[PDB]
Amino acid sequence: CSEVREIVLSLNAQGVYPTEGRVCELMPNPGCFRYKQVRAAFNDARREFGL
């Protein structure tokens, strides 16, 4: 969940829209989002930065 948080943070810092697919594409095991909390963490980070 942390790693997803820095991934979305860096992606928005560069300028690209941080989506689920883009975040997955740069994380070694892009299937962990089936966990009911990692996706929640990603959505919470997006809402915190405003999506």
Added chain:
DNA sequence: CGTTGCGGCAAAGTTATGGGTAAAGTCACACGTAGTCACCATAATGAAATAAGATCACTACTGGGCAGTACCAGACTCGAACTGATG
């Protein structure tokens, strides 16, 4: 009474009108009358075009299951051995 003017009566005289008959005029036969633009509405296509419809391609969002792992016994089966009856 003799004369003179006036008026009725009935042919007689003059116009007019619708008929008939010969005789002076009249006029077409002379290759010829049909013939020709101008006119604006309606059908009637064929082309021009439609306005919507159909499909491709991409982007993002969110359900959500499969190969595999793991335990706790219950229960049947049977090596291996124990032990009793017997001919």
